[PDB]
Amino acid sequence: MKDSDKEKENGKMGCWSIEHVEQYLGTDELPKNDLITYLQKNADAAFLRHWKLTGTNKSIRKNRNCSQLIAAYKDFCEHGTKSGLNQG
């Protein structure tokens, strides 16, 4: 084993480009739900309560437009998140 995998594990999906997120938000390539999913998987409960992504993903993609998801994803990566993305 190598217990430092708890942040340095492989299969860290959903680390997209900013322009991939914003431009493809709502397509078959980058659906809004999967952006919301990545955020509630990786981020702390506070972050989703800040962007109103703390509810059910159905009402979240209906009430929270692309603007919410883009600004969220940007500020997440720019925050330098502790979701095991070059962090530990």
Which experiment gave this structure?
Answer: NMR
**3-state DSSP assignment of residue 25:** strand
Alpha-carbon dihedral sign for residues 37, 86, 68, 29: negative
5: buried, middle or exposed (CB in 10 Å: 19+, 13-18, 0-12)? exposed
Dihedrals phi, psi of 11, to nearest 5 degrees: 95, 25
Residue 38 and residue 81 in contact, taking contact as beta carbons nearer than 8 Å: no
Which CATH number is associated with domain 1-88?
1.10.720.80
User: Which token pair is 77?
Assistant: 């990566």
